[PDB]
Amino acid sequence: SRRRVVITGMGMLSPLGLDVPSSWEGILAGRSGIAPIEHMDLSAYSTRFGGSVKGFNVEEYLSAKEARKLDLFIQYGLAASFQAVRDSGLEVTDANRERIGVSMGSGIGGLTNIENNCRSLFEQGPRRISPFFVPGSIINMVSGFLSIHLGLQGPNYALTTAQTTGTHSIGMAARNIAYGEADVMVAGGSEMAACGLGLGGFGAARALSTRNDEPTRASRPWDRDRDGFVLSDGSGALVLEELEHARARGARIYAELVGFGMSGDAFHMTAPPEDGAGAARCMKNALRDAGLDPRQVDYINAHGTSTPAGDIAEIAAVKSVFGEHAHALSMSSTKSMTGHLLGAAGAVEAIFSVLALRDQVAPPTINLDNPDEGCDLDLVAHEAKPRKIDVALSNSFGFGGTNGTLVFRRFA
Amino acid sequence: SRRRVVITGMGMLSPLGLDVPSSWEGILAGRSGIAPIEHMDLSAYSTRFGGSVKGFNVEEYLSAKEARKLDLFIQYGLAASFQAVRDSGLEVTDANRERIGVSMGSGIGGLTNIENNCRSLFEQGPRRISPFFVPGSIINMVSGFLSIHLGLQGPNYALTTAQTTGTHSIGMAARNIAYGEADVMVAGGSEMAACGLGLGGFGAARALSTRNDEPTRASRPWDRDRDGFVLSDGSGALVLEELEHARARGARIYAELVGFGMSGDAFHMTAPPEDGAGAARCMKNALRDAGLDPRQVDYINAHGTSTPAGDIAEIAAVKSVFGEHAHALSMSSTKSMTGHLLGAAGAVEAIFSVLALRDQVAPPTINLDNPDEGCDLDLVAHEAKPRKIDVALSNSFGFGGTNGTLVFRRFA
Ligand SMILES: C[C@]12C[C@@]34C=CC(=O)[C@@](C)(CCC(=O)Nc5c(O)ccc(C(=O)O)c5O)[C@@H]3[C@H](C[C@@H]1C4)O2
Ligand SMILES: C[C@]12C[C@@]34C=CC(=O)[C@@](C)(CCC(=O)Nc5c(O)ccc(C(=O)O)c5O)[C@@H]3[C@H](C[C@@H]1C4)O2
Ligand SMILES: [K+]
């Protein structure tokens, strides 16, 4: 029989902050983390801005030596993971190390380090490829390195489901606990795809905003003048824990993870169906998993990427799932502020959903000046809205038509 | 309480053949699939051979247009998937499409597409980056594209756990079925890392055999003169199916998937502990999952990568788990013949384990001329061995210390 799963620790790097509290302060203030990119020359690119992590100091977590062997996406994932475990208060011992695992994923992974080694290969030659190229670039090395540093011997894996990664990572980790394969999991996602191939690749697909003159206004989910997503970097990690395990050690419980849904659109490689039918199936799976009446959902943290086709598909899906209740719940996209953290989006947005529960407040959709046709729900335009929130749902969708939904609830 | 999971279809591309029967014929014959690499110039590299897929014809599966969008690892994964679905006889309909999902993974993913996009990027900037670069290179696109082509709407995801990927993919897919989230899953892995970055990266880590003079002798698991793994390419896919679902449509059942285990070494980024303690925990977890006493295991398809440290760690783990029964079972490494398919290794080796059950024969470890110190189990040296096999176990281990074990049994 299925065990209950709660959240006892969280950690983050985002364009708004180097930890959870600083990021969340930005969220509730409606602050943008988007700016012209400084770390490379994007003069030849159609998009020249995004959400960078500012002032990260890897040496708070790892030595210079260890850090230079690892791509930035790995460093970011480790930072968020270490923060979450610290936040949870958990002490790893021989008595529990086999019962604590890790599932930290990425969508794009080590593209940046691969691009740099590729430069070495072609400009210098093959003997300039790093000895640490493979372990420092592969997606599972967040889980790997975290387990090595903390001594975690339970299930150890990584998902890669593009922009759905972080949501799937958390949901599948919760299944491990619910079914008895672990008592504790560290789960989430990390990304740093701000390199030539990243900006260039998403740009070639015409998926990015090109509002170069006003980067903070670029990400504008459901607004009539939206023109694509804003690429952002960072990481999110949660400590998921079996309920009785948490209670026995006197852990602080932020919220309960009650539902997880998955689906496939089976429609198109890079676009959802106009009616968001796949997203609707995914949400219904998550609601049924949680044993809920859809009218119990108070807050939705949308995927809200600011693409023309994506944002309206999600409205359609929400209307299909919730009926008239779609007008009672609040739904917002925190990507309005953070931009799109790709494989880490679902992780940071899970955190934001948990914090919406702790603080009884719906984060805003900033930049929502003129809602587009049919976008007539309570989208929490401009300003955070204090309200009752007993149940929060968080959606992620990805290229390939891969969908995930998490459902969190206040714990008492 | 948990539903039973059986295998009803299989598909493969390997260095031994373009499908399962051809590959398996090679396995039973002790044939090597290793040769000098022909598709690129490795004259200045320290390793110039590996296991290539010979004569793959993508136009049996995809249009030229579709094929030009997709990295070779995705093409290979799709080929194996299409073969497995055909082999299963499953008819996808509106009545079942929400019950059929896909979990096909990769260890390193789109290295070749990245490498090809690199060259232009550094000489002439991002102008020539394809609009399909991102969807055609991300690891979840095997799952994505397969779902789109066949209309599969069930759980849709991808693992990336380096050399463990194929095993974890099959195991986690089995859980989806056992727990009622799907009735059918296509699962496995694919890889095509034979490029400058791949050969150069693994070569920089000093992980590859450099036996260029005798490529077919290079892969020699447990032999005293082994000197690293042999890099190979391909894919494996299984159709996993709930037992009653299979019975109701009169499916041919190859075998039952009874156990899945996972662990982490929490030891080192690129090496196992000398005693294989992580691998031992993983195998025990899989046996506990299956409700089997270690004395019930008849055949182990080892990870057997032909590395100095890897091979002996696995012997130690087997001795620890199985005690005196370690002397009764047979264990072999088919990587002696196929080389190391990385993220696809656990998929093709799951298939080989299923076929060992069908045909009651332990595949050989070829090249085992002089077993190393302590390598004194029945390692099926040189020649296939007909014997009773009721229970077959298959191990995969990966950089980061990530471990997976599958347990299959004859179905009557
Ligand atoms: C063929 C076209 C049609 C096109 C036209 C209008 C659009 O709006 C876009 C730009 C984006 C559609 C979309 O939102 N896809 C989408 C998705 O399915 C799942 C997740 C995300 C995410 O960012 O996490 C995402 O971005 C599409 C893309 C690129 C190209 C232009 O496909
Ligand atoms: C730092 C060192 C020490 C060194 C010394 C002797 C060795 O034998 C090797 C070559 C490989 C160890 C090993 O087997 N790792 C290993 C593993 O843990 C899991 C999976 C696989 C697989 O191939 O699927 C694998 O390859 C190691 C590697 C590279 C480098 C040289 O680490
Ligand atoms: K979300």
PDB file of C-alpha atoms and ligand atoms in Angstrom, chain A residues 131-132, chain B residues 162-164 202 204-208 226-229 265 267-273 303-311 313 335 340 342 345 396-403, ligand 2:
ATOM      1  CA  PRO A 131      40.345  13.600 -19.398  1.00  0.00           C
ATOM      2  CA  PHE A 132      37.218  14.655 -17.463  1.00  0.00           C
TER       3      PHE A 132
ATOM      4  CA  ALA B 162      25.389   6.593 -18.564  1.00  0.00           C
ATOM      5  CA  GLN B 163      26.288   2.900 -19.070  1.00  0.00           C
ATOM      6  CA  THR B 164      23.332   1.806 -16.861  1.00  0.00           C
ATOM      7  CA  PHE B 202      37.041   8.005 -23.526  1.00  0.00           C
ATOM      8  CA  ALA B 204      41.586  10.924 -22.695  1.00  0.00           C
ATOM      9  CA  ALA B 205      40.183   9.090 -19.653  1.00  0.00           C
ATOM     10  CA  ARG B 206      42.414   6.057 -20.612  1.00  0.00           C
ATOM     11  CA  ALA B 207      39.324   3.818 -20.491  1.00  0.00           C
ATOM     12  CA  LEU B 208      39.556   2.203 -23.959  1.00  0.00           C
ATOM     13  CA  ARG B 226      42.537  -6.800 -20.730  1.00  0.00           C
ATOM     14  CA  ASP B 227      43.243  -3.078 -21.143  1.00  0.00           C
ATOM     15  CA  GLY B 228      39.940  -1.221 -21.298  1.00  0.00           C
ATOM     16  CA  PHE B 229      36.516  -1.337 -22.938  1.00  0.00           C
ATOM     17  CA  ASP B 265      28.222   3.163  -4.957  1.00  0.00           C
ATOM     18  CA  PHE B 267      32.404   6.045  -4.244  1.00  0.00           C
ATOM     19  CA  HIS B 268      34.084   7.617  -7.328  1.00  0.00           C
ATOM     20  CA  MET B 269      33.060   9.357 -10.573  1.00  0.00           C
ATOM     21  CA  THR B 270      34.615   6.779 -12.948  1.00  0.00           C
ATOM     22  CA  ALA B 271      35.516   3.693 -10.950  1.00  0.00           C
ATOM     23  CA  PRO B 272      33.701   1.193  -8.688  1.00  0.00           C
ATOM     24  CA  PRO B 273      34.878   0.246  -5.183  1.00  0.00           C
ATOM     25  CA  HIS B 303      28.365  -5.792 -17.164  1.00  0.00           C
ATOM     26  CA  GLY B 304      31.934  -7.183 -18.065  1.00  0.00           C
ATOM     27  CA  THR B 305      33.386  -4.025 -19.699  1.00  0.00           C
ATOM     28  CA  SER B 306      36.994  -5.454 -19.989  1.00  0.00           C
ATOM     29  CA  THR B 307      38.395  -2.702 -17.779  1.00  0.00           C
ATOM     30  CA  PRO B 308      41.046  -3.736 -15.209  1.00  0.00           C
ATOM     31  CA  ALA B 309      39.130  -2.394 -12.188  1.00  0.00           C
ATOM     32  CA  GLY B 310      35.533  -2.958 -13.346  1.00  0.00           C
ATOM     33  CA  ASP B 311      35.740  -6.668 -14.121  1.00  0.00           C
ATOM     34  CA  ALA B 313      34.776  -5.536  -8.768  1.00  0.00           C
ATOM     35  CA  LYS B 335      30.614  -7.469 -24.421  1.00  0.00           C
ATOM     36  CA  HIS B 340      30.209  -1.839 -24.987  1.00  0.00           C
ATOM     37  CA  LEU B 342      27.078   2.315 -23.407  1.00  0.00           C
ATOM     38  CA  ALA B 345      24.319  -2.100 -23.362  1.00  0.00           C
ATOM     39  CA  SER B 396      24.670  -2.608 -15.720  1.00  0.00           C
ATOM     40  CA  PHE B 397      26.934  -0.147 -13.827  1.00  0.00           C
ATOM     41  CA  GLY B 398      27.758   3.425 -14.744  1.00  0.00           C
ATOM     42  CA  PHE B 399      29.984   6.418 -14.176  1.00  0.00           C
ATOM     43  CA  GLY B 400      28.737   8.160 -11.042  1.00  0.00           C
ATOM     44  CA  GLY B 401      28.420   4.782  -9.274  1.00  0.00           C
ATOM     45  CA  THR B 402      24.917   4.189 -10.633  1.00  0.00           C
ATOM     46  CA  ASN B 403      23.844   0.524 -10.668  1.00  0.00           C
TER      47      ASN B 403
HETATM   48  C1  LIG C   2      40.174   7.562 -12.758  1.00  0.00           C
HETATM   49  C2  LIG C   2      40.125   6.251 -13.516  1.00  0.00           C
HETATM   50  C3  LIG C   2      40.886   5.114 -12.861  1.00  0.00           C
HETATM   51  C4  LIG C   2      40.977   4.091 -14.010  1.00  0.00           C
HETATM   52  C5  LIG C   2      41.788   2.889 -13.685  1.00  0.00           C
HETATM   53  C6  LIG C   2      41.499   1.600 -14.110  1.00  0.00           C
HETATM   54  C7  LIG C   2      40.231   1.302 -14.768  1.00  0.00           C
HETATM   55  O1  LIG C   2      39.836   0.129 -14.885  1.00  0.00           O
HETATM   56  C8  LIG C   2      39.427   2.470 -15.317  1.00  0.00           C
HETATM   57  C9  LIG C   2      39.954   2.651 -16.751  1.00  0.00           C
HETATM   58  C10 LIG C   2      37.929   2.098 -15.441  1.00  0.00           C
HETATM   59  C11 LIG C   2      37.194   1.754 -14.159  1.00  0.00           C
HETATM   60  C12 LIG C   2      35.796   1.291 -14.472  1.00  0.00           C
HETATM   61  O2  LIG C   2      35.571   0.139 -14.863  1.00  0.00           O
HETATM   62  N1  LIG C   2      34.841   2.232 -14.409  1.00  0.00           N
HETATM   63  C13 LIG C   2      33.488   2.047 -14.814  1.00  0.00           C
HETATM   64  C14 LIG C   2      32.454   2.162 -13.883  1.00  0.00           C
HETATM   65  O3  LIG C   2      32.777   2.484 -12.605  1.00  0.00           O
HETATM   66  C15 LIG C   2      31.134   1.942 -14.278  1.00  0.00           C
HETATM   67  C16 LIG C   2      30.854   1.638 -15.601  1.00  0.00           C
HETATM   68  C17 LIG C   2      31.877   1.517 -16.552  1.00  0.00           C
HETATM   69  C18 LIG C   2      31.565   1.143 -17.969  1.00  0.00           C
HETATM   70  O4  LIG C   2      32.502   1.096 -18.769  1.00  0.00           O
HETATM   71  O5  LIG C   2      30.387   0.880 -18.254  1.00  0.00           O
HETATM   72  C19 LIG C   2      33.214   1.743 -16.154  1.00  0.00           C
HETATM   73  O6  LIG C   2      34.231   1.639 -17.038  1.00  0.00           O
HETATM   74  C20 LIG C   2      39.513   3.715 -14.381  1.00  0.00           C
HETATM   75  C21 LIG C   2      38.727   4.963 -14.765  1.00  0.00           C
HETATM   76  C22 LIG C   2      39.372   5.917 -15.760  1.00  0.00           C
HETATM   77  C23 LIG C   2      40.647   6.253 -14.984  1.00  0.00           C
HETATM   78  C24 LIG C   2      41.575   5.036 -15.071  1.00  0.00           C
HETATM   79  O7  LIG C   2      38.743   5.802 -13.592  1.00  0.00           O
END
